Amino acid sequence: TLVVTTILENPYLMLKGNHQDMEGNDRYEGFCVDMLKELAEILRFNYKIRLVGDGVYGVPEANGTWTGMVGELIARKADLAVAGLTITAEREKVIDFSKPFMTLGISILYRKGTPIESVDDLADQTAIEYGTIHGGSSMTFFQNSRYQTYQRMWNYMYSKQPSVFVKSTEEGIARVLNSNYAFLLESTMNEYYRQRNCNLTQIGGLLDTKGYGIGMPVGSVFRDEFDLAILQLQENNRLEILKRKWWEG
Numbered sequence: 001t002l003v004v005t006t007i008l009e010n011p012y013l014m015l016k017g018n019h020q021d022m023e024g025n026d027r028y029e030g031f032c033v034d035m036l037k038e039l040a041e042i043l044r045f046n047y048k049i050r051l052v053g054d055g056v057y058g059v060p061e062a063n064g065t066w067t068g069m070v071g072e073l074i075a076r077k078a079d080l081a082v083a084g085l086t087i088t089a090e091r092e093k094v095i096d097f098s099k100p101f102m103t104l105g106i107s108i109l110y111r112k113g114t115p116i117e118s119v120d121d122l123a124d125q126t127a128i129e130y131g132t133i134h135g136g137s138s139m140t141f142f143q144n145s146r147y148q149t150y151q152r153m154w155n156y157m158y159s160k161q162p163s164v165f166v167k168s169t170e171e172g173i174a175r176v177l178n179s180n181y182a183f184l185l186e187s188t189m190n191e192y193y194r195q196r197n198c199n200l201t202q203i204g205g206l207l208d209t210k211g212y213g214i215g216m217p218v219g220s221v222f223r224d225e226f227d228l229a230i231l232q233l234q235e236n237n238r239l240e241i242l243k244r245k246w247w248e249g
């Protein structure tokens with residue numbers, strides 16, 4: 001029985017409408033749940049879904065401790081982390097990842113009727129505030145960039161009061177709809193919320209290209225076979241079908 005650490009995040013992992021009449025794994029739906037099922041049909045493992053204790057994906061502390069689902073993996077509190085867990089060079093030093101099961105990049109979200117046409121335009125004006133989830137992969141992309149536009153954006157987000165950071169994707173989307181705030185978020189989420197809210201638009205293109213991956217502790221015995229199953233899923237178009245099931249509505 002594999003212990004899977006995860007987090008509530010639309011549409012990867014959600015509580016079913018009538019989740020109180022459910023127990024254990026069957027409380028939950030979504031793309032990651034459907035992916036787990038298909039992976040489990042090939043590889044024949046049982047698993048139990050457990051929501052990350054601290055409610056975070058993963059941030060390094062200055063002393064070397066990781067938080068979030070990354071930390072749970074290093075502590076061996078979970079065998080797998082199944083979420084929109086962005087594969088980055090910093091995380092790769094401290095855990096293993098499967099091959100990627102979805103592609104994405106940093107994107108900008110805003111409410112319609114705007115003359116903001118790009119990330120350089122966004123960074124070069126004062127009227128519209130902008131920001132991201134604190135401690136996520138997108139934040140650290142600006143924080144460590146050598147490019148001046150992104151450096152200027154880091155300096156702004158860092159210093160602005162009141163804070164331009166949000167604690168969740170839900171919090172950011174709400175800030176977009178209700179205030180003059182453009183949200184720095186992964187394109188997967190951008191596509192999702194745009195399809196459910198005709199008022200939302202994308203500013204410019206994608207700022208990078210990345211992957212989500214199943215997180216595992218470093219040296220995990222399960223990595224090889226999960227890579228073999230993900231490839232079979234990829235080559236049978238399963239990951240794409242599932243993405244359409246959860247995104248296109």
Ligand SMILES: C=C(C)[C@H]1CN[C@H](C(=O)O)[C@H]1CC(=O)O
Nearest residue numbers: 057084085086136137138185186
């Ligand atoms: C906090 C969330 C929603 C996660 C999801 N992927 C990124 C990560 O795994 O860090 C984070 C989002 C972002 O950085 O824009």
